[PDB]
């Protein structure tokens, strides 16, 4: 008998919550880097197949890049919204750069 | 219905939809040699009344276009003389259910 050099699971990994890429905010690739297991198009198709919409939501959103983001209802955008800078006593409020008018320009 | 022999002049073909509400249908006698609705793979196509269509669109809460389509120039559509909007009932034999009623809208 001959013992083959390969470890059985050299690719043995487990990830709960590890590092994420800046652009996608999704688990980064790399077993040793505490990386994420990819749920590809075929696994997406299989989760649609069972009619199991919360499992798909769980993999492709909830446990991937789920972000509670600010949106302006007036113009419908996530990129124009920003946290306002308040005074010593005042509180910061989420404001839209697009729909807001420059104070001086507001004339009667 | 105008059954022509070999071909029709392109100038003469323009006179076909020139007199509404009267409709003109052209057919080549070589293409009429065999009836297509007699073929085993061609099910029974039945043109529905404006009331029968109205009822079908209600039962399934459908919009005219939201239905499976049949081309206005489809061989069977040309046979029954279908107009745009007219719904056709197709009784097709299935090798799972037997007689099955399906429908198609002529656009």
């Amino acid at each position: 008998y001959q013992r083959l050099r390969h470890m059985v699971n050299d690719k043995f990994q487990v990830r709960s919550t590890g590092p994420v890429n800046s652009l996608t905010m999704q688990p980064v690739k790399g077993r040793k880097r505490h990386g994420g297991i990819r749920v590809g198009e075929m696994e997406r198709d299989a989760l649609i197949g069972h009619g199991t919409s919360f499992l798909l939501q769980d993999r492709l959103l909830n446990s991937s890049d789920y972000t509670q983001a600010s949106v302006c209802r007036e113009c419908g955008s996530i990129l124009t919204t920003q946290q306002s800078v308040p005074r010593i006593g005042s509180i910061s409020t989420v404001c839209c750069r697009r729909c807001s008018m420059r104070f001086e320009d507001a004339k009667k | 219905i105008f059954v022509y022999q070999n071909n029709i002049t392109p100038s003469a073909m323009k006179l076909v939809p020139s007199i509404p509400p009267a409709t003109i249908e052209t057919f080549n006698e070589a293409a009429l040699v065999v009836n297509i609705t007699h073929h085993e793979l061609v099910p029974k196509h039945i043109r529905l009344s404006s009331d029968e269509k109205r009822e079908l669109l209600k039962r399934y809460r459908l919009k005219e276009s939201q239905l499976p389509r049949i081309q206005r120039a489809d061989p069977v559509a040309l046979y029954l003389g279908l107009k745009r909007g007219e719904v056709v009932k197709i009784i097709r034999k299935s090798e799972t259910s037997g007689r099955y009623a399906s429908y198609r809208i002529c656009m």
Binding site: P27, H50, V85 | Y100
Partner: protein
């Protein structure tokens, strides 16, 4: 995702539009002007790409929102372009409108009335009214303006009335109706409009010509040439190539978009423009560039090296060029060369932003543009939206385990201490979580973290037992803060033994490869443990395979993995409704031994085997006390039979309230093996007692109508699972006490059996030469060394077809000798025999191997077949250097007489190696893309609450699933009437009707079913076209889930036929009700993704047909011709012609020949050209044909037919070929005194032919045709033979259009038919005397559609796809095929699953995630399209819950207080 953090607002729809320059300038956080990114020291330069106003960068706070790198979302900036630029994505469109417009009146060159006609048609199409858009063309009255303006008024009047009329009713909303067919009609018009727009040369409004605009690959437009005739009219315009700047084009389009605003309003709006926005030309131009936030332009850090931003390199280059060109144009004010570099700078700035966005459409490795970023490889949509890397997931090599449940997974403690669930702390679980908190993150079952109600997290990782004990006593403390009193603490607890996990084995070809398993943490484990019952569904073999474990983090996802995607419901696959669960190897071999007559057991042994597999403490029992049968032998010694153990296992796992199972099945092992008069093949179960027959792979394997499947139908899926786990343990324990082995003794033949082997193989030596003498055609069987035979075999060697005939004949003959050896020696000649011969036992049981493998081991390997033929042979005629050239021996051809037990002769062994290697390469070389194309177009298709099959956008695909609404995973025992009868009271208790009788109707449908049966019996002998259409099916009129009796006519006919043919306390009327109720309970659930399931049911089994042919296209290439490409040009187009009974076998063969057609080449034997150079080049072309009676009996061609073709076609074709060759060059019996009728014929031919000068044809005998050709002295040398040859095989004497050959095959299933190698229905229509024109079949779908219609083509698709699967003996439910065909015929045409067919689809997001993302996005923006977010793809893009299955409804809470 946090349940403590709910969201009150939701995105309902996405609107595609263009950003205006004015809009960007206001929202911008900072104007970017500097090409440098960093100042000295290391701070970002003010006005640069890294400005802090664009967000927090380099440990500095954002200068807009003030937050740090974590909380700052980043802010958009802008670059002010000094001159407007063409937007690359919309350049093609602005180009179309530039070429289509007049440069004088600034209107489109197309007549205003024609333009208004398009605007009218496009306005009516904003609402779902296509019929009205066509009816507008009927509105009709060089034409006066007063008359044309009345036509525009009458047309506008009809448009306003047709909209209002449809608006009054529920035909269209204020927002307008939009369907795929509506979209198809819009796309057709917008195309036709632009085609008519571009076609006009001279403006129809003002008769002046405009100068034509030309274009290059890059975004740049220029002027065109102009002949004198065009000049003569550009000068009379007033009487009655040069580059054009971006500003000039914008200024031309500015006026045109103002003057033609009415039509463009509907050209650019898919639905009515309720926003009332003006369609401006500046949308196609860029006066500014938005600068994305620093957040999405961060420099990539790889280890120590911090790479410069990929985006900042090309973007800074654009800024350098912008600043350089605005200054190089500023010094020009104080003024050739300055204009030259100014124009050159105007070009390099447009090419700079073009490089900023794209490559392949730039240069000719460059920096990738934003288009390239969205389509890097598969694309951003495919790699990061449709698919994603996930949290709370693990991967490991799978190891087998029979001690865990079939619904469980063995989780290593390594994974258990890392994978956590957010468990909210409550009064009912405070005890359980307090322990987990104390235990911590390294002791299982523990907890890694604790989340307080304020939202903060407390890690338990660094803490000692003391702090953990303190936090545990603080878990259920009441929230002091009123803003979080609603909330309760969470504990991120270790994965326990009660949790669900998603097990995945890639490739996930079908949903069964992704099931839900129950976690079972096994101590001291380093691998994922999996039970053998799961091996089939995952298609996972424990050969070092890897599996993915997903740990869903919420209860809704838990419930789904435990009740929908869980393993228990996967016993039957939806592909064929057959089992995919069962025991695989040791258990099958164990069962054949345990259930054998010879197997006896003492009280001690018997009771041990019972408790060994059935443990009441683990809830395996149903009686709370292990019940035991009495012994089968009382005196002398008390003994139990092996079969009694199987009876006792069922007696303790099946419910006590229900009666025992009754089944009469069969075995894989024939009675002959068990001796004389045994009935051990007949599997008999009477009142849950195994009384006859052993149990094979055919009973407790993944095999239909076996014991496990029978138990599954009578007692349910939970009991069948228990039986599988119980049997699985029993056989494991039995294999431990009573082992199973395989050895040399199982491979040996007896001295008698080995004698038979040598004697049958002694006749094989003659076979080699016998077959070689048959194909060669030689009487009395010539010797092997015959010189004429060796010359004849050489002829065969040089031709691929001739060698094929030799190989197929010799193979069939030697394989007949093989079959004889195997039939004699196995098993009647084997030394050790079944049940003791384990090698034989494993093949018969179905545990592992077959009788073919057994025969290669004990008898012979046989003929080594290579790519359908024998062994390859060298140019020398030698198959090996050892064999003689043209050796007429079976061994030389690859026939191996040797077996693996005795060994293979060196010569034989080399041949075997060739066969082995060939098998290996095909596996490596040869369903991914085929399935991907179907799934992307069918993802949305599901079952609606109105039982119809509807797409994602609500468009109807089918009125009912397969026409009967039955779930394939239920349609199994629905025809097993005897089974259902034997288990009447068991199933009546299962399908409890007492809680349903008040919710359904018992007569309405049952009465109607009789009325339809009445009219059906009346027109039984009548044809389908003459059949009554009075009453349509009962399923069409009554809902199957509400009316008892609304059943498919197929089920109705089958059920009634059973009650008539079988007269048997159950009445024939009460049984009818039970079966009616069974059908009701077998209905497909509304929400079921029948679309994905269908594509998975066609994809997954199409992997089994990756191997090559053993004429027509088969397997995946044929499936691709249909589903993937919908080819109108099929590789093997055929026609099946049903011949009558009055037409004989000889008459049909004569008819085949008649359709059969000869060519001039086919009747010619020799051509002799006697080139004599004289005066004049004289060419004497003599056509020596075959004998007149020979070609007349082989092609049905007369001598008269040959005369007409040569005298009219051939000579005219030959003369044209010689003239063309002249231009290309410069760029025995004696016949004499020909006479009278012949002289007049020759003289007439001389007048019709220029160079032949002569033309004499054999009119009496009909064997030759001689004609002389006279050429000029300047024509010189020419290769006439080669010229003649080519024209002969090009000259047609005969042929029926589009048909090549008509053949007569063996009658297919009793039907007398003729298979054509071509398609032309109209030609076969004339052969009514021979062919039944109402039964003429064809494989070509497009050809069928063109002649017989969409429904006929639809029927061809379901039949042809079925032929592909039936050939490889794969059964796919017609419900899948019918759905696929209905989707291909949804538009009334023949659409394929590809980019072309998809064009007519509502979801632009679905389209973007398929291919050409930026292209589909451009088409969406130009339509001003609203993505309704109703397709699975679109929902995934915006993070919305999928509308399929659990997302097909809403959950509302009933609250008591007013």
């Amino acid at each position: 995702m946090d349940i403590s953090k709910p969201v009150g607002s939701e995105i309902t729809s996405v609107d595609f539009g263009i950003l205006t320059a004015k809009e960007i300038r206001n929202l911008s956080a900072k104007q970017i002007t500097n090409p440098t990114v960093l100042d000295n020291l290391g701070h970002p330069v003010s006005g640069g790409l890294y400005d802090l106003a664009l967000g927090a960068f380099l440990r500095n706070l954002c200068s807009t929102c003030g937050l740090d790198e974590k909380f700052c979302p980043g802010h958009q900036g802008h670059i002010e372009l000094p001159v407007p630029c063409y937007n690359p994505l919309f350049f093609n469109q602005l180009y179309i409108y530039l070429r289509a417009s007049c440069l004088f009146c600034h209107h489109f060159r197309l007549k205003s009335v024609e333009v208004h006609r398009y605007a009218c048609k496009l306005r009516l199409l904003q609402y779902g009214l296509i019929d009205e858009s066509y009816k507008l063309d009927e509105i009709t009255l060089d034409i006066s303006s007063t008359l044309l303006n009345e036509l525009k008024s009458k047309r506008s009047e009809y448009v306003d009335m047709a909209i209002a009329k449809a608006l009054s009713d529920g035909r269209t909303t204020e927002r307008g109706s939009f369907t795929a067919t509506v979209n198809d009609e819009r796309k057709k018009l917008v195309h036709e409009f632009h085609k008519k727009l571009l076609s006009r040369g001279k403006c129809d409004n003002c008769g002046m010509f405009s100068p034509k605009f030309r274009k290059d690959g890059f975004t740049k437009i220029f002027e065109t040439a102009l002949n004198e005739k065009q000049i003569t009219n550009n000068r009379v315009k007033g009487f009655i190539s040069t580059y054009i700047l971006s500003t000039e084009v914008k200024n031309i389009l500015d006026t045109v978009f103002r003057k033609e605003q009415c039509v463009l309003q509907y050209v650019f709006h898919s639905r009515p423009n309720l926003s009332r926005k003006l369609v401006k030309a500046d949308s196609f131009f860029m006066d500014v560039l938005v600068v994305p936030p620093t957040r999405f332009r961060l420099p990539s850090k790889l280890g120590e090296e911090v790479h410069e931003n990929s985006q900042n390199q090309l973007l800074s280059k654009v800024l350098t060029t912008s600043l350089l060109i605005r200054d190089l144009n500023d010094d020009l004010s104080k003024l050739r060369v300055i204009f030259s570099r100014l124009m050159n700078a105007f070009v390099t700035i447009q090419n700079d932003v073009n490089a900023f966005i794209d490559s392949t459409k730039a240069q000719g490795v460059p920096i990738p543009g934003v288009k390239q970023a969205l389509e890097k490889k598969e694309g951003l949509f495919r790699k990061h939206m449709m698919g994603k890397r996930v949290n709370y997931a693990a991967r490991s090599v799978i190891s087998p385990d029979p001690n865990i449940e079939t619904n469980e997974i063995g989780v290593p403690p390594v994974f258990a201490v890392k994978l956590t669930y957010p468990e909210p702390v409550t009064a009912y679980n405070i005890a359980e979580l307090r322990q987990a908190v104390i235990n911590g993150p390294d002791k299982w079952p523990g907890a890694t973290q604790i989340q307080n109600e304020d939202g903060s997290l407390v890690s338990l990782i660094g803490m000692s037992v003391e702090q953990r004990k303190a936090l545990a006593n603080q878990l259920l403390t009441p929230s002091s803060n009123v803003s979080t009193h609603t909330l309760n603490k969470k504990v991120y607890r270790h994965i326990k033994n009660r949790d669900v996990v998603l097990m995945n084995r890639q490739p996930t070809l079908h949903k069964a490869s992704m099931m839900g398993h129950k976690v079972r943490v096994l101590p001291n484990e380093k691998t994922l443990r999996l039970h053998y019952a799961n091996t089939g569904a995952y298609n996972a073999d424990f050969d070092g395979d890897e599996m993915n474990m997903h740990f869903p983090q919420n209860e809704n996802a838990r419930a789904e993995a435990l009740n929908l995607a869980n393993t228990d419901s996967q016993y039957l696959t939806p592909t064929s409704g057959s089992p995919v669960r069962g025991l695989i190897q040791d258990h099958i071999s164990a069962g054949v031994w345990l259930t054998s007559k010879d197997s006896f057991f003492t009280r001690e042994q018997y009771q041990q085997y019972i408790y060994g597999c059935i443990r009441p403490e683990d809830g395996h029992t149903t009686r709370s006390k292990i019940v035991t049968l009495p012994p089968t032998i009382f005196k002398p010694y008390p003994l139990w039979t092996g079969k009694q153990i199987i009876t006792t296992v069922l007696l303790n796992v099946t419910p006590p309230d229900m009666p025992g199972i009754n089944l009469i099945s069969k075995n894989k092992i024939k009675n002959e093996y068990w001796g004389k008069g045994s009935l051990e093949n007949e599997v008999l179960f009477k009142d849950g007692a195994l009384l006859c027959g052993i149990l094979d792979k055919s009973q407790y394997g993944a095999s239909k109508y076996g014991i496990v499947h029978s138990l599954h139908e009578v007692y349910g899926p939970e009991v069948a699972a228990k039986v599988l786990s119980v049997l699985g343990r029993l056989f494991t324990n039995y294999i431990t006490a009573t082992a199973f082995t395989c050895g040399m003794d199982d491979l040996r033949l007896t001295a008698e059996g080995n004698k038979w082997r040598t004697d049958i193989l002694k006749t094989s030596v003659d076979t080699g030469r016998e077959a070689a003498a048959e194909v060669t055609n030689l009487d009395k069987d010539t010797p092997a060394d015959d010189p004429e035979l060796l010359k004849r075999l050489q002829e065969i060697l040089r031709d691929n077809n001739k060698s094929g005939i030799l190989d197929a004949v010799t193979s069939s003959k030697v394989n007949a000798i093989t079959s004889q050896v195997v039939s004699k020696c196995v098993p009647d000649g084997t030394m050790k025999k079944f049940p003791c011969n384990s090698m034989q036992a494993m093949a018969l049981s179905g545990a592992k191997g077959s009788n073919v493998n057994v025969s290669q081991i004990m008898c012979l390997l046989g003929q080594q077949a290579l790519e359908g033929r024998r062994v390859p042979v060298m140019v020398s005629g030698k198959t090996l250097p050892s064999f003689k050239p043209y050796e007429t021996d079976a061994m030389a051809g690859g026939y191996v007489k040797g077996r693996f037990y005795s060994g293979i002769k060196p010569q034989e062994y080399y041949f075997h190696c060739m066969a082995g290697r060939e098998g290996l390469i095909d596996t490596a070389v040869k369903s991914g893309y085929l399935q991907r194309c179907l799934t992307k177009q069918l993802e949305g298709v599901h079952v609606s609450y109105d039982n119809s099959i509807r797409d994602a956008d609500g468009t109807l695909v089918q009125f009912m699933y397969g026409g009967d609404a039955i779930d394939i995973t239920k349609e199994s025992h629905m025809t097993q009437f005897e089974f259902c009868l034997d288990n009447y009271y068991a199933l009546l208790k299962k399908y409890n009707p007492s809680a349903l009788i008040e919710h359904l109707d018992v007569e309405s449908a049952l009465k109607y079913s009789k009325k339809t049966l009445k009219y059906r019996k009346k027109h039984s002998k009548e044809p389908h076209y003459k059949q009554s259409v009075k009453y349509d099916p009962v399923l069409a009129k009554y809902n199957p889930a509400k009316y008892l009796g609304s059943v498919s006519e197929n089920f109705q006919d089958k059920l009634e036929s059973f009650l008539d043919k079988n007269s048997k306390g159950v009445n024939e009327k009460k049984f009818r009700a039970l079966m009616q109720l069974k059908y009701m309970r077998s209905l497909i659930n509304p929400g079921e993704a029948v679309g994905i399931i269908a594509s998975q049911s066609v994809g997954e089994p199409s992997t089994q047909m990756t191997l090559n042919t053993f004429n027509v296209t088969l397997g995946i290439p044929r499936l691709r011709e249909i589903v993937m490409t919908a080819s109108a040009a099929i590789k093997t187009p055929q026609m099946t012609l049903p011949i009558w009974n009055d037409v004989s076998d000889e008459q049909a063969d004569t008819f085949c020949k008649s359709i059969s057609k000869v060519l001039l080449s086919e009747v010619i034997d020799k051509v002799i050209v006697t080139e004599t150079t004289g005066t004049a080049r004289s060419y004497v072309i003599h056509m020596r044909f075959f004998d007149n009676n020979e070609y007349s009996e082989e092609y049905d061609v007369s001598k008269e037919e040959l005369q007409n073709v040569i005298s009219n076609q051939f000579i005219h074709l030959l003369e044209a070929a010689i003239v063309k060759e002249i231009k290309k060059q410069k760029r025995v019996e004696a016949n004499n005194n020909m006479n009278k009728v012949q002289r007049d014929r020759q003289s007439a031919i001389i007048s019709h032919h220029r160079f032949i000068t002569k033309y004499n044809f054999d009119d009496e005998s009909g064997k030759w045709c001689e004609f002389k050709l006279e050429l000029a002295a300047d024509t010189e040398k020419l290769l006439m033979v080669n010229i003649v040859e080519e024209i002969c095989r090009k000259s047609i004497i005969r042929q029926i259009p589009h048909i090549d050959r008509c053949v007569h095959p063996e009658p297919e299933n009793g039907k007398r038919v003729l298979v054509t190698e071509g398609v032309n229905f109209q030609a076969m229509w004339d052969q009514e005397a021979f062919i039944d024109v109402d039964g003429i079949t064809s494989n070509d779908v497009a050809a069928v559609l063109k002649t017989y219609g969409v429904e006929a083509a639809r029927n061809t698709i379901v039949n042809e796809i079925n032929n592909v699967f039936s050939r490889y003996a794969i059964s796919v439910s017609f419900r899948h095929l019918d759905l696929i065909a209905d989707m291909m015929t949804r538009q009334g045409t023949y659409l394929a699953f590809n980019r072309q067919g998809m064009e007519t689809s509502t979801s632009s997001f679905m389209k973007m995630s398929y291919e050409t993302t930026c292209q589909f996005l451009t088409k969406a923006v130009l339509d001003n399209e609203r993505e309704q977010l109703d397709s699975p793809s679109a929902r995934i893009v915006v993070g919305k819950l999928n509308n399929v299955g659990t997302g097909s409804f809403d959950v509302l809470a009933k609250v008591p207080n007013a």
